[model samples]
Target: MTTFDDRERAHEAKFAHDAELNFKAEARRNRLLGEWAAGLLGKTGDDARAYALTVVTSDFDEPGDEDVFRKLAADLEGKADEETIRAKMVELRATAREQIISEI
Candidate 1:
């Protein structure tokens, strides 16, 4: 293959890899958020792990985080307010991305 073609393939591969990493990071963040929320909800052991899995799957319902937020908001209710949830999401997302990058 020509140099140009090789470069193009490398670029495409990088893009795909980046997308995969991003998806993993997002899912990790969701799981972390789920665990946090589960603590507030008094869930533990297998229940907490299951709840975290649900949060990870919630992202599949839509293109944005609104679906996840809605689920948490409803589940949390009086336990945690909107602002707290949103803030935690932001914090966990950063932590998730850091963890993913470090793993690489």
Candidate 2:
């Protein structure tokens, strides 16, 4: 019974760790995405960071990536199209996950 309890605890700990990492990764991805978009929008320095924060907060509106996608899509209509934005999201998500995991 003690061994079983230990195994269960380990499983739960891993789940929590993964959950935390996932959350952080998403936020990081959003920040990166914001910076990329900000450049196209001609924002720099504090303005760029401020814009990134808005992108990060946009995710809180609802579940999934649609909220972030819509904001970027609208803001970057002429600069970046849907395909480019989606591809960047996918790429940045992977990069964010890698960066987060590397820090561990």
Candidate 3:
């Protein structure tokens, strides 16, 4: 029988659901940001894909996105009038979350 009423089951289900959402959202945010950066840097096709992969990989460097932010900051410097990607990251993060949650 499904133990949907059990507190333990509810907590476990919540944890699992949240974990999946986090994973999907983080990846999506990375992909979107990476694509935005790649476009800014004049990359396309396979080059853009590779750059996006690197952005996803950078997240494993720490619990937060500081590594991605730092790397993107250095890479984007002098490229445009853009100063930092922080604001876009935050924005994309929310968009990513809503997208993922909606898709579910």
Candidate 4:
């Protein structure tokens, strides 16, 4: 369980999933990326693809980045803010990580 055999498989599956989506060439690439991101939780091929769409649409930065910190000061605290949404999105991303692990 500790080795990356599974992780590698997931990565390959991710690439394949992405390829199929790309073949369709829809304008929903960003949304599709999210479903792929979420698939770290290891769903079946199609279910994983469907959920990736949700992940990308949610205004998330590419997980574990400092974009959240900047968004907080600039947006949520003052001005026309998207920070609140950013903060919440980050929280959900974190929770997703935890929940995915728990799902396994």
Clash tally, candidates in order:
0, 0, 0, 6
- Which ranges in model 1 have alpha carbons more than 4 Å from their true place? 1-27, 57-65, 97-104
Off by over 4 Å in 4: 1-29, 56-104
* Model 4 residue 1 lDDT score: 45
Query: Tens-digit lDDT track for model 1 on 2-38?
Result: 5553222222345356764456765676666677877
The segments of candidate 2 whose C-alpha lies over 4 angstroms from its true place after superposition are 1-27, 57-65, 98-104
Q: CA shift at 5, candidate 3, in angstroms?
A: 37
* Candidate 1 residue pairs in backbone clash: none
How do the residues 1-104 of candidate 4 rate in per-residue lDDT, one tens digit apiece? 46545332232334346764233332333433444334344565777766654444334456665553464345335422454444444445345534433433
Q: Top model by lDDT, which number?
A: 2
Ranking by TM-score: 2, 1, 3, 4
Model 4, total clashes: 6
lDDT tens per residue, model 2, 32-70: 677788889999999989987776543533465556667
Better of 2 and 4 by lDDT: 2
TM-score computed on alpha carbons, candidate 3? 0.52
TM-score of each: 0.56, 0.56, 0.52, 0.25
Error of 1 at 78 (Å): 1.2
Question: Residue 42, candidate 4: how far off, in angstroms?
Answer: 1.1
